[PDB]
Design a protein around this ligand. Structure first.
Ligand SMILES: Nc1nc2c(ncn2[C@@H]2O[C@H](COP(=O)(O)OP(=O)(O)O)[C@@H](O)[C@H]2O)c(=O)[nH]1
Ligand SMILES: C[C@]1(c2nc(-c3ccc(N)cc3)no2)CCCc2sc(N)c(C#N)c21
Ligand SMILES: *SCc1nc2ccccc2[nH]1
Ligand SMILES: [Mg+2]
Length: 167
């Protein structure tokens, strides 16, 4: 029976969650993609010699702490916590996203990967060392990515699948 992996891509609006997901599924960089549209994607892949189905939720829209929104995010098995390396607030917001995940999953060891997106941009404001240290404190991997060039994209999602398998 082919295993399905439910991944949820989270992070501040504009960090590149939609661009990262479309790059993984369709292998192209979409410049303009409505910031309010939330959608699901599927991709069958082989990871470490095992065929599996990725079911990815590309989150969007306003902040909502309803019983229903909490139960929907509770269905996620692994979370890609994305920030943009050229926006310090998106990086500081990561503390909030992790605490919300920890709260709804009622667990301190939820499969998760920290992702620094837009590594193609020269206007960096978040130091790789600062991100690596935050990831160490949480005990999770840190993958730098660029949805524009495809740097680290397969690596970000496949790393999250491996975190779920071990868990
Ligand atoms: N240079 C660069 N721009 C990116 C990258 N990823 C996303 N963008 C741009 O950042 C903006 C927001 O991307 P989007 O995927 O809509 O972000 P979301 O709100 O997190 O889904 C768009 O103009 C994208 O083209 C990246 O890795 N590099
Ligand atoms: C999706 C997510 C979340 N989104 C936000 C957020 C913050 C600010 C803005 N502007 C937009 C969204 N903070 O956490 C993370 C995963 C776990 C849960 S549980 C739940 N009810 C969530 C919601 N909403 C969440
Ligand atoms: S829209 C189908 C769907 N719902 C999800 C929740 C969490 C992770 C992936 C998902 N896909
Ligand atoms: Mg989006």
């Amino acid at each position: 029976g082919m295993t399905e992996y439910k991944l949820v891509v989270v992070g501040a609006v504009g960090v590149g969650k939609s661009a990262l997901t479309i790059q993984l599924i369709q292998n192209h960089f979409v410049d303009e993609y409505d910031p309010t549209i939330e959608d699901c994607y599927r991709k069958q892949v082989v990871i470490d010699g095992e065929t599996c189905l990725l079911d990815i939720l590309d989150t969007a829209g306003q902040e909502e702490y309803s019983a229903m929104r909490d139960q929907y995010m509770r269905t996620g098995e692994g979370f890609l916590c994305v920030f943009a390396i050229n926006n310090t607030k998106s990086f500081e917001d990561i503390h909030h996203y992790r605490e919300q995940i920890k709260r709804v999953k009622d667990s301190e060891d939820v499969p998760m990967v920290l992702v620094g997106n837009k590594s193609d941009l020269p206007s960096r404001t978040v130091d790789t060392k600062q991100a690596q240290d935050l990831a160490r404190s949480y005990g999770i991997p840190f993958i730098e990515t660029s949805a524009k060039t495809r740097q680290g994209v397969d690596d970000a999602f496949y790393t999250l699948v491996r975190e779920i398998r071990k868990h």
